[PDB]
Design a protein around this ligand. Structure first.
Ligand SMILES: Cc1cccc2c1CC[C@H](CN1CCC(c3c(Cl)cccc3Cl)CC1)C[C@@H]2O
Ligand SMILES: CCCCCCCC/C=C\CCCCCCCC(=O)O
Ligand SMILES: CCCCCCCC/C=C\CCCCCCCC(=O)O
Ligand SMILES: CCCCCCCC/C=C\CCCCCCCC(=O)O
Ligand SMILES: CCCCCCCC/C=C\CCCCCCCC(=O)O
Length: 282
């Protein structure tokens, strides 16, 4: 369980993340859409990111009420919606980041149309649907111990399907996506050795370098925010359950950290992207 002070602290953090995150993300989407022609492929992917982040941020009020009350009072439909938005958020985020890194390597190695990027976004959501619809069906509000909870139900026997879904989710929603990114940036590093002012026009080269560092930083913040949760949930699938109060606290705060990422992303755009930093003020 959790003390009420820790609960009010967590849910307060959720409120701040929700307001600032929705404001910033809606501002980013509004920028790329109705304030300019910033429709570069990178910004199309960024738009996808801000979209998923928007959706999960909407779930935070309900997760917070749930954390306060200790149970899920909204029924099945909102529970399925929340779970689906959750998995959709993870998979869409990692896949979009992967597409961003691949696009970066395409630009560095082969010196990309916004519409192609939009098609990539469609495919990203398609795979994210391959995972996201099943959990939306299996997700349910179950009175496990005479109390209502919101979870995905592992098929019987749970001691087998638990690990299968655990390691599969861990690999294909995190490790394999992260690994492709690592490959892309490693190939880019090998490419740029002994190359000064190469790849065409010096000024545009600078621009490319700025975008590359932006993508890398966003990826680094994402991974750094979600790695504890990914590891802990992997341990959860193996049956390793937290029974201490402080254990529950650490776990809750790690999830909170991931949602902090969900509000973190526009700030990174404001400090690391010139067009966003200028456009934010105007
Ligand atoms: C408070 C509350 C109320 C209703 C539902 C839930 C939660 C808690 C957070 C959890 C947060 N989830 C965050 C994402 C996490 C995860 C996912 Cl969806 C996919 C791959 C790896 C991980 Cl670590 C699985 C846990 C979701 C849950 O459905
Ligand atoms: C974001 C945080 C939201 C703040 C919490 C607001 C409401 C919690 C109290 C509502 C009590 C409803 C109980 C419903 C029920 O028991 O079925
Ligand atoms: C999801 C997977 C998409 C894989 C295709 C990679 C997108 C390349 C980006 C681009 O060339 O513009
Ligand atoms: C939810 C739906 C996600 C599917 C829409 C993805 C395409 C976004 C591209 C765009 O509108 O700029
Ligand atoms: C779009 C995702 C919606 C998926 C529909 C899930 C409902 C299935 C069910 O509740 O039995």
């Amino acid at each position: 369980f959790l003390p009420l002070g820790l609960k009010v602290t967590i849910v307060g953090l959720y409120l701040a993340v929700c307001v600032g995150g929705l404001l910033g993300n809606c501002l980013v989407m509004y920028v790329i859409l109705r304030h300019t022609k910033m429709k570069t492929a990178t910004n199309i992917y960024i738009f996808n990111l801000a979209l998923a982040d928007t959706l999960v941020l909407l779930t935070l009020p309900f997760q917070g009420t749930d954390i306060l009350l200790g149970f899920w009072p909204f029924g099945n439909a909102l529970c399925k919606t929340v779970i689906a938005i959750d998995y959709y958020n993870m998979f869409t985020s990692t896949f979009t980041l992967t597409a961003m890194s691949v696009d970066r390597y395409v630009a560095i190695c082969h010196p990309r149309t916004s519409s192609k990027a939009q098609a990539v976004n469609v495919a990203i959501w398609a795979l994210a649907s391959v995972v996201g619809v099943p959990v939306a069906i299996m997700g349910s509000a179950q009175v496990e111990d005479e109390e209502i909870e919101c979870l995905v139900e592992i098929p019987t026997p749970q001691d087998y399907w638990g690990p299968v879904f655990a390691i599969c989710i861990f690999l294909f929603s995190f490790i394999v996506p992260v690994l492709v990114i690592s490959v892309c940036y490693s190939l880019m590093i090998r490419r740029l050795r002994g190359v000064r002012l190469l790849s065409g026009s010096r000024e545009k080269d600078r621009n490319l370098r700025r975008i590359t560092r932006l993508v890398l930083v966003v990826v680094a913040v994402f991974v750094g925010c979600w790695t504890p949760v990914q590891v802990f949930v992997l341990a959860q699938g193996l049956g390793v359950q937290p029974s201490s109060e402080t254990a529950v606290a650490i776990l809750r705060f790690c999830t909170a950290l991931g949602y902090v990422n969900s509000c973190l992303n526009p700030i990174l755009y404001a400090f690391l992207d010139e067009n966003f930093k200028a456009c934010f003020r105007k």
